[PDB]
Design a protein around this ligand. Sequence first.
Ligand SMILES: CCCCCCCCCCCCO[C@@H]1O[C@H](CO)[C@@H](O[C@H]2O[C@H](CO)[C@@H](O)[C@H](O)[C@H]2O)[C@H](O)[C@H]1O
Ligand SMILES: CCCCCCCCCCCCO[C@@H]1O[C@H](CO)[C@@H](O[C@H]2O[C@H](CO)[C@@H](O)[C@H](O)[C@H]2O)[C@H](O)[C@H]1O
Ligand SMILES: CCCCCCCCCCCCO[C@@H]1O[C@H](CO)[C@@H](O[C@H]2O[C@H](CO)[C@@H](O)[C@H](O)[C@H]2O)[C@H](O)[C@H]1O
Ligand SMILES: CCCCCCCCCCCCO[C@@H]1O[C@H](CO)[C@@H](O[C@H]2O[C@H](CO)[C@@H](O)[C@H](O)[C@H]2O)[C@H](O)[C@H]1O
Ligand SMILES: Nc1ncnc2c1ncn2[C@@H]1O[C@H](COP(=O)(O)OP(=O)(O)CP(=O)(O)O)[C@@H](O)[C@H]1O
Ligand SMILES: Nc1ncnc2c1ncn2[C@@H]1O[C@H](COP(=O)(O)OP(=O)(O)CP(=O)(O)O)[C@@H](O)[C@H]1O
Ligand SMILES: [Mg+2]
Ligand SMILES: [Mg+2]
Lengths: 571, 571
Amino acid sequence: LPEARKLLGLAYPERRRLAAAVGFLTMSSVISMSAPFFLGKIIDVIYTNPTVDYSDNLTRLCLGLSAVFLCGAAANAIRVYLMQTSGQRIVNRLRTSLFSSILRQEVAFFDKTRTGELINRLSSDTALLGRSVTENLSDGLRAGAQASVGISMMFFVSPNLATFVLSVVPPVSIIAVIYGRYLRKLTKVTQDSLAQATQLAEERIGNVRTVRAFGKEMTEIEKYASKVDHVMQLARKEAFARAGFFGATGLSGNLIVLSVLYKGGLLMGSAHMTVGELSSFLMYAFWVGISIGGLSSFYSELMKGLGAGGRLWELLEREPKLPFNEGVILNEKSFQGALEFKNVHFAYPARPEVPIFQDFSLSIPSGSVTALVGPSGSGKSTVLSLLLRLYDPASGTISLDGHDIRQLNPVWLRSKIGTVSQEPILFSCSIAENIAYGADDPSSVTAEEIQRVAEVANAVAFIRNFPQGFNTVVGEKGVLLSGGQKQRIAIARALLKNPKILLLDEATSALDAENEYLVQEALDRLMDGRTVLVIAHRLSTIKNANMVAVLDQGKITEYGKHEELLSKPNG
Amino acid sequence: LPEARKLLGLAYPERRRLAAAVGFLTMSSVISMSAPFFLGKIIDVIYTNPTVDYSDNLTRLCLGLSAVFLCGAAANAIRVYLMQTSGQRIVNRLRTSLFSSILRQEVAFFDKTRTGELINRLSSDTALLGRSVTENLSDGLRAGAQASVGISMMFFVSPNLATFVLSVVPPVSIIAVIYGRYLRKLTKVTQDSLAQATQLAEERIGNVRTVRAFGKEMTEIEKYASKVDHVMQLARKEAFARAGFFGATGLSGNLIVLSVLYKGGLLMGSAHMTVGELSSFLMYAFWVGISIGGLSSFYSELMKGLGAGGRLWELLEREPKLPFNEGVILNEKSFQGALEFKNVHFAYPARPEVPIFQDFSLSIPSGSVTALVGPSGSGKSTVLSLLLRLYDPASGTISLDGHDIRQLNPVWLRSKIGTVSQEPILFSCSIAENIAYGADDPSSVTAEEIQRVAEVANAVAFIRNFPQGFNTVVGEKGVLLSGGQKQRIAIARALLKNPKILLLDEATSALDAENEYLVQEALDRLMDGRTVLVIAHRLSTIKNANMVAVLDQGKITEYGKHEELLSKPNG
Ligand SMILES: CCCCCCCCCCCCO[C@@H]1O[C@H](CO)[C@@H](O[C@H]2O[C@H](CO)[C@@H](O)[C@H](O)[C@H]2O)[C@H](O)[C@H]1O
Ligand SMILES: CCCCCCCCCCCCO[C@@H]1O[C@H](CO)[C@@H](O[C@H]2O[C@H](CO)[C@@H](O)[C@H](O)[C@H]2O)[C@H](O)[C@H]1O
Ligand SMILES: CCCCCCCCCCCCO[C@@H]1O[C@H](CO)[C@@H](O[C@H]2O[C@H](CO)[C@@H](O)[C@H](O)[C@H]2O)[C@H](O)[C@H]1O
Ligand SMILES: CCCCCCCCCCCCO[C@@H]1O[C@H](CO)[C@@H](O[C@H]2O[C@H](CO)[C@@H](O)[C@H](O)[C@H]2O)[C@H](O)[C@H]1O
Ligand SMILES: Nc1ncnc2c1ncn2[C@@H]1O[C@H](COP(=O)(O)OP(=O)(O)CP(=O)(O)O)[C@@H](O)[C@H]1O
Ligand SMILES: Nc1ncnc2c1ncn2[C@@H]1O[C@H](COP(=O)(O)OP(=O)(O)CP(=O)(O)O)[C@@H](O)[C@H]1O
Ligand SMILES: [Mg+2]
Ligand SMILES: [Mg+2]
């Protein structure tokens, strides 16, 4: 019931197009159901009057039927168009609405939901739902109307023959459903066995180095051969049941038709029916058969659409656990760029058992370079995720110029913070579009502005050296870039953003010699006159930093100047 | 032509089952094609003699038809079984033969071929090929025979009406193929546009952290909305062409049938034909129509099967670039376990541009522990891949007791070498089956032997602590184990193998305190009385090693004792 109201509201903006096409469907289906009745009358006319010339009647009827078909073709053409376009408009609304809900969700949601599932819900499930209220609804409506008129016309033509069909088909159908359920079981048994054998195959192929190492290729080959030779034994049993079922289905189908031809034939000779009347009944019986299969198919697709519906309403009505674009903004005067971690406790949502910060307190003063030092896996990169408010701490507070970052507008907060990652991420756009991404309006930035920041970032040389220049499509689906090239485009993107706070994640595994000089020069121009928090692995950056913070087991164990920290009581 | 001989040879072991079922198919199809001809004669009998009682004739004919259907059902049941089983036996041979060819290939082949493609070729393409010589062949044979008899019976019943159908259908069909080709183009245009929009969606969802960082969620939402709103415009144009095509197809189909009813109707009145004769012709015309669609479908599946055939014969006939189980074996007397790298040059096949070893010479003496020292990414793990002969060097030689490992049987060579990896690999088997994997005959090892090696490896405690004990299914698809637990089962597997040469890859990122003691004790028992080559990151192992080798830029830069290396001219 609550799912039905959601499906009705989905079709509601297209109600006039769908009703017009339903009108065309109703007409086409009803006028078409007249053909067995009128063909029954024409059959009896020829039979009664074999001596009469019907040339003018045939020509007048065929010219009449030609115009009816031309109208029928135009009606069907208009109907298909209205149904396809209505579905397209429904799917379009579902695509834009779903993608909007997804991007508004917190990072933690993406941590527990695979991109593949979100894309499957965006591609497959939106297509299902769209046609389920349109094309599927028309299919089930046509089949439902044709079964109704068909059964009614069977009882109209002959109540005796119709009651007979009604007493024979249901018992046969119930027995066929029991045989069909047994056949489904034997198929699962064969396909479970086959799945096991393919998992074995996939595991051994994927880990062929370990298989070689232990000289087990011949062993695995024979292990797999035994599994698939067993699948063959299960498939033989499934084939025997399927053969016996197709034989039983075929026999029953033929003997039911034969019973109607026989009973009908007897009723003809008894003067209860005519040859044409029997032809009507058989034609209507064939139509009901097709209409039953049509309703059956409609039901399968209705279920698939309802299943897809639940998966979409689940994301569309999902409220993010972190504010999207809501909170305060600070004026030019009260914003200085000072940050403060105060007794911060945090564990990732995917691994809540593993604590990252255990009473983490750090003061990053305005315009000062703070160097974050610690062992690999200590949780240095987690500091950047918390400052951008990708996640909220479990306990403690993160403050910007005395304000808890939870009170600020997150979109605004992130506009004041720039980041240059260990492994920069570039989308499959032009180099210019990737650089423009820094700006609050990437459409407003001029070609001259993209060139300026590219020169400062020591990127302008390799970019112009590319055949397409700034229009070179990069990312995964485009032209591949070196680590240092990606980093300089990231520095260009940061430069254009022009943040007061800058967060730097240095590479522990240092890049090439020629890159490492051009990148260090660009990083220094980017660090100038900004609040910098650097996760450093180079002794040159720690020495030049205003203060050094040592992260050991989720807490700041040591805090002071590089010289003061090195000149510890034990040295 | 060469593909046709391969398809014939594939069906050859099943030739007697397939020929028997073809015999049953031929009978069923031919006896069935008699029904429109005999129904035409019965129609004319009723018409000519309306005053005659046909009760006994009807009852005798229906009882006769009942027995013919019972034979027809039994023939169809036997045919389906023989076709399903024949295909199953063909697919089974294809599965075992393909998996055997895959596991026999060199590691470099797996480096350039994705497991997904190999599994798709093992699952999908084997199923296609199997039914293409069976079920598809029966389908195309039936359709081909029924179109032949159908067209022959159309010309037999009426050469005038058949010539008429033959002059009308081909021109209409050619125009429909041109419209169908145009419709395919408009569909690709819409689906190329939709693909672009989904790639954008997937990229942005997958990289939502970067999108948040630059506050571009609202920007991307509107970028995607614009792309899918454009897809809607292309889909509207595709729907207009599809509507006009379904209308044209429907009209033509109806007007062709109407032409035959009209021309036939006129020929009836002229005394050139009877009502029954026309019914025969129309029934045969409907059968040819279905048979044309049948041949068309058979052709699509023949092409799919030929495509899959080429992909399978490609791997089945592939000769590995490295010997599988061919070469010499050394006697107890001449095998001591001494290894020697001599001027080894090697670059991985996937990255040939990047050299790993540049004149690499190393002597690992019998019963001596050699510690391999070098920077991360220097190519220390590549030494283990070359010793197991997973790859062959480009230049230089690897020798075992003076013998080039290329002359030895690789399966035998690997039986004398054991490895304990940084990240051990366990299959989705029981713990016992994973341990038994060490033995040359994992079926021959007793429960007592698996328990012995488990005690030495300090693994017996946690294994027995598991609810299923040694029968606990581990790996990816089973119960998850800690790094130290996996390593101790790897040490148990190595212990059972009992190799003379042992290759150890220590973890640079050291595991937990409780594990690191139980693992170091088990590693020491495993190192005892063996030729050991350890890639060390712990100062305790380098100090206790007989000699240390420093790997710097694919060459052994320094070679000597830990004390001698530390007491270098500059220290
Ligand atoms: C696939 C599963 C198997 C299918 C089931 C097969 C069951 C057998 C079907 C037999 C059909 C013949 O059924 C037979 O029809 C005639 C004609 O209506 C009936 O005959 C009776 O009614 C008719 C009127 O309807 C009278 O003219 C006639 O005098 C009277 O005897 C028989 O009482 C009935 O037995
Ligand atoms: C397996 C094959 C099955 C084939 C179908 C069954 C055939 C059975 C043969 C017996 C039927 C012949 O039975 C006979 O049919 C004609 C035509 O309908 C009936 O005739 C009735 O309709 C015709 C019009 O069609 C009128 O001209 C006639 O005045 C009227 O009585 C006869 O009254 C009836 O006795
Ligand atoms: C979907 C695309 C459109 C479909 C194409 C439609 C084309 C029009 C079809 C018209 C059919 C009638 O075709 C007409 O048949 C009769 C009967 O055979 C022919 O009539 C001729 O031959 C018959 C014998 O065959 C003689 O009895 C008759 O005296 C003679 O005139 C006409 O010469 C022919 O014109
Ligand atoms: C859109 C609807 C189309 C419906 C199909 C076309 C109907 C056309 C109506 C005109 C046909 C009537 O034409 C008439 O048919 C009968 C029956 O075949 C023929 O009769 C012929 O066969 C019957 C047997 O069936 C014999 O009893 C008879 O001796 C013989 O001449 C007539 O010689 C012919 O003139
Ligand atoms: N999305 C996520 N879900 C769960 N755990 C995550 C995670 N992202 C990171 N982690 C884990 O959090 C821990 C600390 O993360 P982080 O990446 O911050 O540290 P680090 O930057 O100190 C590693 P390195 O020094 O090698 O770059 C790691 O053990 C990491 O695997
Ligand atoms: N199958 C493969 N194809 C291509 N390159 C590969 C490869 N396996 C390894 N490499 C590359 O070869 C180089 C050296 O490999 P290897 O794994 O031997 O070194 P290492 O063991 O010194 C790394 P670490 O010290 O971090 O464990 C690396 O740059 C690695 O990425
Ligand atoms: Mg990091
Ligand atoms: Mg390694």
